[PDB]
Structure 1
Amino acid sequence: GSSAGFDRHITIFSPEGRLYQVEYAFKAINQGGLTSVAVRGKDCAVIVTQKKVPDKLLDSSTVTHLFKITENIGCVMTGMTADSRSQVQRARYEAANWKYKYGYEIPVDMLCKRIADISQVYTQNAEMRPLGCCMILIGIDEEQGPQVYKCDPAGYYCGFKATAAGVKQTESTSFLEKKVKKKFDWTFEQTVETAITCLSTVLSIDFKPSEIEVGVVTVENPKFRILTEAEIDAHLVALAER
């Protein structure tokens, strides 16, 4: 943990080879206090996050961390709300530019690979700070199938069978690692159930059909849709009955 100069104030290397500013951006994801869980099945991908409405004054229809980047690609944002919208707006622009320049919908893997490239510049140039947000894109590829990609402030990116971001990321990761070890190609119903269960078990909330948001993409309909409270209640009822 040695320091020499401005290694803690700008994105420059520490004596042991560390970028503290980039590391501090990771602790910024937990500032919102929300956890997101994404699970990929045999033919579907599901993103689940908790929505907190502290007062009835807030319009709950607006407090959403689920964003439709394009028709076939959706994402869940964790971290600073202000930084999250900029990444979503940036991701939407790159998706639209890819469609215009190349003539086909941008792949999920290449969407963050661009976004991780933008966020890498923030970790190399010192006049701006890294965006304290985490991006998890889910979408149905033409050939590879369902895809899940986490997109961290450091410019790192990787595919995931089931990932999580937020305060309870490592608690939820251990839960999802156990479920994946069983090696079950979950159906659409099971992926939503394990995604809701992962957020439910880790947080111990026993979710109501107003406290989480579910966004799913399926092979049958490769479009990103937000689950309504009626649709979300069916899965919660199914969880309770089993």
Structure 2
Amino acid sequence: NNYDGDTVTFSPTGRLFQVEYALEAIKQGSVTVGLRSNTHAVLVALKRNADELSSYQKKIIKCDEHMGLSLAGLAPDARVLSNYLRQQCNYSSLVFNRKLAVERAGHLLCDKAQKNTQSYGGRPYGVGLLIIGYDKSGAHLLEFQPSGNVTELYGTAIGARSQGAKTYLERTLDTFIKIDGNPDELIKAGVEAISQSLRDESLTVDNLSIAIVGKDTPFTIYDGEAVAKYI
């Protein structure tokens, strides 16, 4: 109200309204699902078009051979944060000959987002990220909020109507976690999860974006006729 003019101001109840408004930009964003087994981690994203002449806005960004994320909210903010992850993944490889742990990637994103919430002049990031990766401790899924809060999960969803996909995954938890050494079945579970967040529109060939990373699978994005198999 009087306390939402900048990110440096607490409200009388100890809330940061600029951060809460940034969090709102994510809810307006198109739905994206993350889920993993013990062998593979999968991103599924519903891409959003401007109109019938326009392309569908790309949602999934590759960060390294073993790590990448899906975005919901301000796409340029995802580009800045994903670029930062690309550099941190790259620094780890060049200096230490070491693939960056997904958990440490989460800690780095948290700390970068935090600095924008405690300084004058800046603004919070207006995007939410689902980071998947396969490192030395197996498959990982992270959820990033521009508050700085990063959370390790078996599955989740962010964006408009994400609650439908999240409830489904909460039911299926015991089933999809056990889908080991079967990439196609894990993606099916992700496509079935994101389907709980659709209204009026359905998954078409230029609508659906899928990414997968796993034990002997580099981070690869599937778009166009490569996802027709799953429609």
Moved runs in structure 1, 4+ residues, more than 6 A? Answer: none
Q: Equivalent residue of 1:106, what SS?
A: coil
The equivalent residue for 2:131 is: 137
Q: TM-score, normalised by structure 1?
A: 0.86
Q: Kindly state the Cα deviation for residue 83 of structure 1 after the two structures are TM-superposed.
A: 1.4
The equivalent residue for 1:239 is: none
Cα pair 2:45 2:209 within 8 Å, conserved: yes
Cα pair 2:176 2:186 within 8 Å, conserved: no
Cα pair 2:208 2:223 within 8 Å, conserved: no
Matched, 1:50 2:46: yes
Cα pair 1:25 1:131 within 8 Å, conserved: yes
Q: Kindly state the Cα deviation for residue 231 of structure 1 after the two structures are TM-superposed.
A: 3.2
Unmatched tracts of structure 2, length 5 or more: none
Q: TM-score, normalised by structure 2?
A: 0.90
Read off the aligned partner of 2:205 and give its amino acid letter.
P
Q: 1:31-180 residue pairs with structure 2 within 5 A?
A: 31-32=28-29, 34-60=30-56, 63-142=57-136, 144-180=137-173
Change (3 A) 1:184 1:95: closer
Distance 2:155 2:31 in 1: 14
Q: Deviations over 1:172-195 (max 9, x none)?
A: 211111111557512322220111
Change (3 A) 1:167 1:224: same
Q: Equivalent residue of 1:93, what SS?
A: helix
Unmatched tracts of structure 1, length 5 or more: 237-242
* Matched residues, number: 227
Matched, 1:30 2:27: yes
Distance 2:160 2:204 in 1: 20
Taking only the aligned residue pairs, the percentage that are identical comes to 24
Cα pair 2:205 2:225 within 8 Å, conserved: yes
Distance 1:176 1:16 in 2: 33
Q: Kindly state the Cα deviation for residue 169 of structure 1 after the two structures are TM-superposed.
A: 2.2
Distance 1:24 1:56 in 2: 30
